[PDB]
């Protein structure tokens, strides 16, 4: 493999050609924001709960950014579920629902950003390349809306019209795209259990698991969007994620310090 | 049970970027054909990227950039092809419309005029899926996602070859390249070699709700696009495996 | 002496967000009615916010956010209702148009097609007036401000009740709720209780230049919107106190 | 009052319902940018005068931001009055005039921002949430165009087509919305007088007055837009404003230091 | 060999900002004339800046601002004139369209409606050419650049005087001001004094590809615009020195 | 000359009037960003070459910004030449080609910015007034796309449809507009030669030359766009430019230190 061979394949072959694909795989790997951590704040699990959940997270964010560069993406939550149900009932397709759901993640980003503004932390579009705030010790964090850009071009799920790629997927892909060091999902449960702990009383906590192990246990669709787990397996940069309970005070801060709170899900 | 069709009267045509790359010799006859089609159909014409995207991939991969960096850079080449094609059709009332306009306002724009042109790339951008260093969701994929989301009457893909062969008809195995008048997305997905359409296209066909078939036709042969829009078989038909209600 | 009418041939229809909240059971008959109205009128259809805005108010007020924070968050729900309604009418040539387009380019858009849909909320945003923790200038208000600024032929408000009653017909005093076939904005402004229309609506009616009356009709009863657009009395007429020149 | 009662009212009642309105009134009050001061630079009174007025104000701004976080909004001035008169003469309504006037405040923001750029002070949209510049000691100020966003939805005045909410109102509402500590209007008179000092020779200076006292004296429409005074009475955060003469060197700086230059107008 | 004409059926009309500055007395008859022209032509109507731009130049030059600062500030005045003119024509389907829309989507917009209005200033902005402290590429220049880039059927310039004179007919030498029924761009470029059209206009005429002549007519005389659009000689014809193929 | 005379001329005369033009010439001269250096990174000459050319330039940029405020504009290169040839072959006019070429300079800015993001350097629109990054020692540089905004209003060349004002002109005019102290073009040759050094073997290096001298030697159209040289002669602020070889390690850094590497082209 050289640059010459790669460039010949790129000019002369279809992009579908396996030889071109292999040659491209050998390319160098630049990490755009290797020192950053992407964090997702759940919409339903955190922001929808209002002040008791959001205020302590704001304080953790403000403390944490002293030592940790953060990109903080927002979830959507119950308003998006409401839009999805109205639109699904009208027979609208997944691509129209995707657009509706972004508006809700945007609302949540706006509310979070207004709480963080006096601490110098902006809501941005383009979190990965908001180069200035991420470079200043006085800021060192940004907030972003966690929905992917796919809109009407959203790939539908195999069944039904609910967009399969939502804010878990949006935040994860940003972490993956920018070669971030860490991806933390902040939800309302301590992590992954052997069953849904809200429903089942005898669910057992799982500190660490691979995506394959999750699928083999039928946890494919549980605390993270199942499409996220497939993304994680194909990821180049972020080969594991951590799910933590944002309702526990200091849990985010402790996860940022390398404490193994919550569940670690590994690509392999 | 399947979603409704948003624009059932719409016809979508995806013009390959490598067709555009041939310049006036390919583009003038295509433009004359499109002109005559305008009164017959309500058209969304979407352009692919072609060779310039290969160049930006060569630069970007050399810089080490991830696949999400490469996706919008390639998309820009499709967009530029779209502006070029629209400019040639301007005197007939045709313009380039941006992705937000396509996504939210195509109905009003096709009420105003007979056809509009847009980039066939979907806005996956920095949220492009990882795994390959080449962006998987390219122009064929974007065009199909739209056509199917709209529940369009059809999607026709305009290529620089007759259709799909069993091997690249311009490649090192071109002597064994056999033309495929008809195929299913599933059969294509299970073969290994190169195709004239994105592999992600076959994936989105598997989840499609409306479009039963997509014809790939040679835009270098005048009349084939017109015939394809009338459902005449003049290229490769790809069955998506959607079935009627 | 009064300003000219910018679009005297325009009819504005405001659909309540709580009508949209009922989903397909309310929306499909409304859509079928709108479809049949399209050839009869040049329509600007504006959607309100409904229940989702209440949810974002519940979250935002709990976070302590000021009224200017809450106004654009509620407005976004009206915008989403508008996209949903437009999508159902897309096959008839109808699309959602953004506030800048409504404000500056409605003439050309209603030349292109028979109707467009937009959010009824006005862009007061962070410059919403203080005093109440709930944004005062909501969907009825925004719709009226536009209709009157345009000098439209009418504004019809489509509600989930028959019109205005002397008390909330769904509230704890609903036994004393008496239907009001006709009222003036001034009489309404001087009563204390709840209304199915913004209180700010009555304020902007007092300064209105063109629109003499606004009918509030039940969008849950097919035919009432059509009748209201023909000036038939089938809901509550609100006299704005504008008088002819 | 609890969150439960409020949330029930919010779901079950019209927003017009007095019970819901009262419950919402009891909500906590977050100030978004409590350390900032909003300043309006008059269009007609300052920027239209060019260099002799603008250059010293620029120097004060640059000195003042060392110790004071500033949001500096621009007025419109004579070009807007020209647009208003052309448009009014054609019978155009207040909402079309509002749009025309923003363009002029925008021009003024652009000219001011070009003078301030080498000092690190940006012209922004979204002054209240330009979280980064406001958080940096090296910047600590932004410039914004002072017109409200209402455009075609501008509420007209009771008579005539001149937009009643212009740049005084725009800047004030931003201060009020973001819970700023102070609102300073920078004009070309030392403050409020008992009559218009340009016209009347025996006008007496008023150091401090309430809005009610102003109305009772028929100064409802004088040095501030009369709609601003009504806004001030309904304000939650900024319950008084200060009007100062920007033509006096150091007047802005002294007002920022808590010196009682000019006129203080109080909500009550 | 010359570029193709993008919109050969287009007529471009540039209305001087100083015509707009006269207010209703000039604008109402112009509007009534434009109204009657709408069915006859496909019009792009572009407004200049007039006196407000002089005011912003007075402020900006006093602040020491460079010519690139002044160019977009003046342009904004042309844009505001355009919004005012469009508003008066709204009831006929006319709207203001932004520069990106003019540049990329004029075809579809003139399919929707008979005319649109835009700012005649070109977006040179901070990249305005240096040399003079006054922006050289103003409304006449921008209008011509567009008309010629489109290969429009014509560009007519609507002035507040009869056409070009040998001196300012409103200036201190107005007694020697002789009317010029016809002139060439080259002759004008070689004279020193003031003109009612940008000097940069003459420069872009020298490089023009399509437009053979531009008529400057008095918009204060009803009928002259209509006559000029029919190629009747009622003002000053400027020959650009383009010759037929 | 006074402000009064100027203002009378401005109200009463055509802008074409030579008396008004002379009066305007006497206006004060404000430099917006006098401490900044504008640098253009060649598209064909540098960025198209990929990593071997771009990575060392990135390192120089990162080192240089410690001591030098930089605006770094990108060229377009071979993808733009490809667009130009397709479009020219269809008979499209210069104004349509201009639009096509910006997209390519934009791509190049995006690639460069992704390399610089972790060092705090943003890609911006409005480089001249990106007041914040330019004011922070932690940043002190921005990247911009070097095409001028003219688009369809691009003035065509006397012959053919290639836009005569491209990225050399775009970057130069930004330097001129913002009154920058220095303008450096970074290409792939040590500077100007008496003939094209890629083609002619006996070309002689020219350390310093005026625009007039270049024209008299028929180098009007050589290493810089010929329209740039005319712009340079009319410039108010940047009366000379420096062309350096970005392929030579430290050449940019040395040019920023006042070392006379490359060729200095003077307006006069
Ligand atoms: N096996 C499991 N372990 C832990 N949690 C589970 C499991 N199965 C289901 N869950 C549920 O999944 C929920 C997380 O999904 P949820 O949509 O609330 O997250 P979110 O990030 O808030 O989404 P959004 O941000 O879009 O609202 C948990 O609250 C939990 O009730
Ligand atoms: N199995 C196949 N059948 C037909 N063509 C093939 C096959 N495999 C590879 N190809 C090649 O794909 C080429 C078409 O290339 P490609 O699909 O990249 O262009 P395009 O569709 O114009 O580009 P874009 O996707 O940017 O619009 C054909 O000319 C052919 O050489
Ligand atoms: N005096 C009244 N007459 C009629 N309805 C009333 C009255 N007072 C309160 N209401 C209530 O207002 C409800 C309509 O609610 P609302 O006006 O909030 O919905 P909407 O107009 O659909 O919402 P949006 O303003 O977001 O578009 C009615 O169903 C009724 O219960
Ligand atoms: N009683 C009064 N006391 C002081 N000033 C008064 C009074 N009555 C009228 N004025 C006038 O009001 C003027 C302030 O209004 P003006 O519109 O100039 O302010 P502005 O902020 O520059 O407005 P804009 O910014 O939109 O141009 C003062 O210049 C003064 O002449
Ligand atoms: N040689 C000339 N012939 C005719 N008019 C001239 C000449 N020289 C100067 N003028 C003046 O130019 C005036 C027209 O001014 P100008 O061209 O600035 O206005 P405009 O074209 O309406 O403005 P804009 O360029 O902003 O649209 C005429 O009224 C006349 O006084
Ligand atoms: N007399 C000369 N001296 C030096 N170089 C010359 C001369 N004449 C021609 N050249 C050529 O001009 C080239 C510079 O132009 P080029 O377009 O490559 O620069 P660029 O900034 O990369 O343009 P873009 O950025 O748009 O790609 C040099 O590579 C050199 O080959
Ligand atoms: Mg292909
Ligand atoms: Mg209601
Ligand atoms: Mg003129
Ligand atoms: Mo969006
Ligand atoms: Mo957005
Ligand atoms: Mo926001
Ligand atoms: Mo916002
Ligand atoms: Mo931003
Ligand atoms: Mo921004
Ligand atoms: Mo956005
Ligand atoms: Mo967006
Ligand atoms: Mo956006
Ligand atoms: Mo970005
Ligand atoms: Mo961006
Ligand atoms: Mo970016
Ligand atoms: Mo930024
Ligand atoms: Mo930012
Ligand atoms: Mo920034
Ligand atoms: Mo757009
Ligand atoms: Mo747009
Ligand atoms: Mo968007
Ligand atoms: Mo848009
Ligand atoms: Mo828009
Ligand atoms: Mo837009
Ligand atoms: Mo806007
Ligand atoms: Mo727009
Ligand atoms: Mo605006
Ligand atoms: Mo704006
Ligand atoms: Mo600006
Ligand atoms: Mo700007
Ligand atoms: Mo900004
Ligand atoms: Mo920005
Ligand atoms: Mo803006
Ligand atoms: Mo704006
Ligand atoms: Mo905007
Ligand atoms: Mo904002
Ligand atoms: Mo914003
Ligand atoms: Mo924001
Ligand atoms: Mo920012
Ligand atoms: Mo900013
Ligand atoms: Mo636009
Ligand atoms: Mo737009
Ligand atoms: Mo643009
Ligand atoms: Mo646009
Ligand atoms: Mo647009
Ligand atoms: Mo652009
Ligand atoms: Mo752009
Ligand atoms: Mo970017
Ligand atoms: Mo980007
Ligand atoms: Mo920016
Ligand atoms: Mo930005
Ligand atoms: Mo942009
Ligand atoms: Mo742009
Ligand atoms: Mo832009
Ligand atoms: Mo700017
Ligand atoms: Mo800007
Ligand atoms: Mo700016
Ligand atoms: Mo900024
Ligand atoms: Mo920035």
Q: Within 10 A of E244 (CB to CB), how many other CB atoms are there?
A: 5
Tally: H helices and E strands in chain C: 9, 10
CA distance C233 to D4: 41
To test the pocket of ligand 4, the residue of D222, D225, D262, D265 to mutate (highest count of ligand atoms within 8 Å of its CB) is D222
Index of the ligand 3 atom closest to the CA of residue C165: 3
F263 lines ligand 6 (CB under 6 A): no
How was this entry determined?
A: X-ray
Q: Give strand ranges (E) for A80-215.
A: 141-145, 182-187, 192-193, 205-206, 208-210
The CATH classification number of C1-245 equals 3.40.1160.10
Residue of F38, F29, F30 whose CA lies nearest to F180: F38
Contact call for residues B198 and B189 (beta carbons, < 8 A): no
Query: From the CA of B73, how far away is ligand 17's center (Å)?
Result: 18
Count CA within 13 A, CB hemisphere, residue E187.
10
Contact call for residues A171 and A180 (beta carbons, < 8 A): no
Question: What residues of A are in contact with residue D134 (Cβ under 8 Å)?
Answer: 117, 120
Continuous segment of H or E residues that includes residue F150: none
CA distance D177 to C149: 27
**Residue partners of A2: CB distance under 8 A and separation at least 6:** none
Contact call for residues C17 and C49 (beta carbons, < 8 A): yes
The tokens describing A204, both together, are: 């057992």
CA distance B207 to B228: 24
Give the nearest chain D residue to C199 (CA atoms).
D16
Contact call for residues A102 and C76 (beta carbons, < 8 A): no
Q: Select from F10, F28, F92 the Cβ nearest to the Cβ of E54.
A: F10
Chain F contact for A7 (CB, 8 A cutoff)? no
CA distance A110 to C59: 12
Contact call for residues F141 and F61 (beta carbons, < 8 A): yes
3-class secondary structure, C149: helix
For chains D and F, CB pairs below 8 A equal 45
Contact call for residues C216 and C159 (beta carbons, < 8 A): yes
Rg (CA), chain B: 17
CA distance A172 to A168: 6
For B:62-121, CB contacts with A below 8 A are 62-69, 99, 102-104
Q: Exposed, middle or buried by CB within 10 Å (0-12, 13-18, 19+), for C174?
A: exposed
CA distance D121 to D134: 9
Q: Please judge whether B5 and C91 are an interchain contact, meaning their C-beta atoms are less than 8 angstroms apart.
A: yes
F187 lines ligand 6 (CB under 6 A): yes
To test the pocket of ligand 4, the residue of D187, D191, D213, D242 to mutate (highest count of ligand atoms within 8 Å of its CB) is D187
CA distance B144 to F199: 48
Question: What residues of B are in contact with residue E5 (Cβ under 8 Å)?
Answer: 91
Chain centroid, CA A188 distance in Å: 15
Residue B180 sits at the vertex; the CA angle it makes with B174 and B182, to the nearest 5 degrees, is 165
Query: From the CA of D188, how far away is ligand 64's center (Å)?
Result: 31
Question: What residues of F are in contact with residue D133 (Cβ under 8 Å)?
Answer: 131-132
CA distance D129 to D112: 20
Q: Is the dihedral of CA B166, B170, B171, B173 positive or negative?
A: positive
Determine phi and psi for A263, rounding to 5 degrees.
-115, 135
C139 lines ligand 3 (CB under 6 A): yes
Chain D contact for E241 (CB, 8 A cutoff)? no
Rg (CA), chain D: 19
3-class secondary structure, A267: coil
Continuous segment of H or E residues that includes residue B105: helix B99-112
3-class secondary structure, D42: coil
Q: Select from F25, F99, F149 the Cβ nearest to the Cβ of E124.
A: F149
Question: What residues of B are in contact with residue E107 (Cβ under 8 Å)?
Answer: 86, 89-95, 113
**Residue partners of B135: CB distance under 8 A and separation at least 6:** B67, B70, B71, B74, B124, B128
Q: Exposed, middle or buried by CB within 10 Å (0-12, 13-18, 19+), for B174?
A: exposed
Residue of C74, C85, C4 whose CA lies nearest to C43: C85
Closest residue to atom 13 of ligand 1, CA basis: A223
Q: Please judge whether D155 and C51 are an interchain contact, meaning their C-beta atoms are less than 8 angstroms apart.
A: no
Question: What residues of B are in contact with residue A6 (Cβ under 8 Å)?
Answer: 58, 61
The tokens describing B32, both together, are: 């004359």
Helices (H), ranges, C91-138: 99-112
D44 lines ligand 4 (CB under 6 A): yes
To test the pocket of ligand 5, the residue of F11, F12, F13, F14 to mutate (highest count of ligand atoms within 8 Å of its CB) is F14
Residue of E201, E193, E113, E124 whose CA lies nearest to E159: E201
Chain E contact for D109 (CB, 8 A cutoff)? no
Q: Please judge whether C24 and A50 are an interchain contact, meaning their C-beta atoms are less than 8 angstroms apart.
A: no
End-to-end CA distance of chain D: 27
**Residue partners of B3: CB distance under 8 A and separation at least 6:** A91, A92, A93, A94, A161, B151, B209, B210
CA distance D45 to D189: 8
Q: Please judge whether C23 and A86 are an interchain contact, meaning their C-beta atoms are less than 8 angstroms apart.
A: yes
Contact call for residues A131 and F122 (beta carbons, < 8 A): yes
End-to-end CA distance of chain F: 27
Q: Please judge whether D234 and C131 are an interchain contact, meaning their C-beta atoms are less than 8 angstroms apart.
A: yes
Q: Within 10 A of A251 (CB to CB), how many other CB atoms are there?
A: 21
Query: From the CA of D243, how far away is ligand 38's center (Å)?
Result: 31
**Residue partners of F262: CB distance under 8 A and separation at least 6:** F190, F191, F242, F243, F244, F245, F251, F255
Looking at the DSSP assignment, which residues form a beta bridge with residue A240? Answer: A266
Q: Give strand ranges (E) for chain E.
A: 10-15, 42-47, 95-96, 115-119, 154-159, 164-165, 179-180, 182-184, 213-218, 236-239
Continuous segment of H or E residues that includes residue F254: helix F251-256
Residue of A64, A58, A49 whose CA lies nearest to A187: A49
A74 lines ligand 1 (CB under 6 A): no
Contact call for residues F71 and F128 (beta carbons, < 8 A): yes
Q: Within 10 A of C72 (CB to CB), how many other CB atoms are there?
A: 21
Q: Please judge whether E23 and D86 are an interchain contact, meaning their C-beta atoms are less than 8 angstroms apart.
A: yes
The single-letter DSSP state of residue D39 is E
3-class secondary structure, B236: strand
Chain C contact for E116 (CB, 8 A cutoff)? yes
Chain centroid, CA D75 distance in Å: 9
3-class secondary structure, C138: coil
Q: How many residues does chain E have?
A: 245
Q: Please judge whether B95 and E108 are an interchain contact, meaning their C-beta atoms are less than 8 angstroms apart.
A: yes
Residue of D72, D63, D70, D54 whose CA lies nearest to D188: D54
CA distance B142 to F18: 57
End-to-end CA distance of chain C: 9
Contact call for residues F174 and F71 (beta carbons, < 8 A): yes
B146 lines ligand 2 (CB under 6 A): no
CA distance F217 to F194: 8
Q: Where are the domains of chain C?
A: 1-245
CA distance F259 to F252: 10
Chain D contact for A139 (CB, 8 A cutoff)? yes
Breaks (C-N over 2.5 A) in chain D follow: none
Long-range pairs of F57-62 with CB within 8 A, sequence gap ≥ 24: F57/F186, F57/F246, F57/F252, F58/F112, F58/F115, F58/F116, F60/F249, F60/F250, F60/F252, F60/F253, F61/F116, F61/F121, F61/F141, F61/F252, F62/F116, F62/F119, F62/F121
CA distance E135 to E73: 10
Continuous segment of H or E residues that includes residue F58: helix F51-64
Residue owning tokens 């990162």: F62
Helices (H), ranges, A13-116: 18-25, 51-64, 78-89, 94-116
Determine phi and psi for B108, rounding to 5 degrees.
-70, -35
Q: Within 10 A of E32 (CB to CB), how many other CB atoms are there?
A: 12
Q: Select from D17, D153, D169 the Cβ nearest to the Cβ of C146.
A: D153
Q: Is the dihedral of CA E187, E193, E198, E203 positive or negative?
A: positive
Index of the ligand 3 atom closest to the CA of residue C171: 31
Contact call for residues D147 and D171 (beta carbons, < 8 A): no
CA distance D69 to D36: 5
Structural domains of chain D in order of their starting residue, each with its CATH number: 1-268 (3.40.1160.10)
Looking at the DSSP assignment, which residues form a beta bridge with residue C117? Answer: C45, C96
Q: How many residues does chain D have?
A: 268
Query: From the CA of A133, how far away is ligand 24's center (Å)?
Result: 7
Give the nearest chain F residue to B80 (CA atoms).
F100
Question: What residues of B are in contact with residue C116 (Cβ under 8 Å)?
Answer: 108
Q: Within 10 A of D215 (CB to CB), how many other CB atoms are there?
A: 15
CA distance B120 to B214: 15
**Residue partners of F222: CB distance under 8 A and separation at least 6:** F192, F196, F214
Pick the residue of E111, E146, E150, E210 with the most B CBs within 10 A to test the interface with B by mutation.
E111
Helices (H), ranges, chain D: 3-12, 18-25, 51-64, 78-89, 94-116, 167-177, 211-216, 226-234, 251-256
Give the nearest chain C residue to E97 (CA atoms).
C105
Give the nearest chain A residue to B60 (CA atoms).
A27
DSSP string covering F16-62 = T-HHHHHHHHTS----SSTTEEEEEE-TTTTGGG-HHHHHHHHHHHH
DSSP string covering D202-226 = T--EESEEEHHHHHHTT-SSSSS-H
DSSP string covering B163-201 = SEESS-TTSTTTTS--EESEEEHHHHHT--S--SS-HHH
CA distance F259 to C71: 58
Q: Exposed, middle or buried by CB within 10 Å (0-12, 13-18, 19+), for F256?
A: buried
CA distance A176 to A165: 15
């Amino acid at each position: 493999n050289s640059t010459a061979e790669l460039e010949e394949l790129l000019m002369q072959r279809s992009l579908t050609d396996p030889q071109l694909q292999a040659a491209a795989a050998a390319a160098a790997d630049f990490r755009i924001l290797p020192d950053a951590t992407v964090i997702k704040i759940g919409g339903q699990s955190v922001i929808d709960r209002g002040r008791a959940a959001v205020y302590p997270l704001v304080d953790e964010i403000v403390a944490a950014r002293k030592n940790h560069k953060l990109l903080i993406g927002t979830g959507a939550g119950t308003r998006a579920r409401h839009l999805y149900s109205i639109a699904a009932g009208l027979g609208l397709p997944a691509g129209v629902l995707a657009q509706l759901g972004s508006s809700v993640a945007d609302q949540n980003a706006a509310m979070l950003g207004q709480l963080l503004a006096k601490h110098g932390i902006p809501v941005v579009g383009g979190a990965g390349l908001s180069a200035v705030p991420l470079s200043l010790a006085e800021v060192n964090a940004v907030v972003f809306s966690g929905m992917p850009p796919y809109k009407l071009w959203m790939r539908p799920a195999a069944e039904g019209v609910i967009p399969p790629y939502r804010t878990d997927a949006g935040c994860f892909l940003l972490a993956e795209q920018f070669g971030c060091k860490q991806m933390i999902f902040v939800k309302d449960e301590d992590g992954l259990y052997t069953a849904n702990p809200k429903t089942s009383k005898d669910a057992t906590f799982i500190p660490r698991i691979s995506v394959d192990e999750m699928k083999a246990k039928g946890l494919h669709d549980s605390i993270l969007e199942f499409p996220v787990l497939d993304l994680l397996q194909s990821a180049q940069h972020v080969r594991e994620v951590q799910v933590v309970n944002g309702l526990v005070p200091g849990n985010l801060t402790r996860a940022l310090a390398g404490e193994h709170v919550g569940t670690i899900i590994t690509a392999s | 049970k399947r979603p409704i069709r948003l624009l059932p009267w719409l016809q979508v045509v995806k013009i390959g970027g490598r067709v555009m790359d041939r310049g006036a010799d390919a583009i003038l006859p295509l433009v004359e054909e499109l002109r005559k089609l305008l009164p017959e159909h309500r058209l969304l014409i979407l352009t692919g990227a072609g060779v310039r995207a290969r160049h930006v991939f060569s630069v970007g991969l050399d810089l080490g950039l991830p696949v999400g960096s490469l996706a919008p850079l390639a998309a820009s080449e499709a967009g530029q092809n779209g502006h070029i094609l629209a400019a040639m059709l301007a005197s007939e009332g045709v313009s380039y419309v941006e992705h937000p306009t396509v996504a939210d306002q195509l109905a009003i724009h096709l009420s105003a005029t007979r056809a509009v042109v847009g980039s066939a790339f979907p806005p996956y951008h920095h949220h492009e899926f990882p795994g390959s260093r080449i962006p998987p969701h390219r122009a064929d994929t974007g065009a199909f996602l739209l056509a199917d989301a709209f529940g369009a009457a059809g999607l026709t893909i305009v290529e620089n070859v007759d259709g799909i062969y069993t091997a690249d008809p311009n490649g090192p195995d071109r002597g064994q390249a056999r033309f495929l008048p008809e195929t299913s997305a599933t059969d294509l997905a299970k073969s290994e070699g190169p195709l004239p359409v994105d592999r992600a296209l076959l994936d989105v066909m598997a989840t499609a709700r409306h479009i039963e078939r997509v014809q790939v036709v040679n835009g270098l042969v005048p009349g084939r696009l017109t015939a394809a829009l009338r459902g005449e078989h003049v290229g490769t038909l790809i069955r998506t495996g959607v079935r009627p209600a």
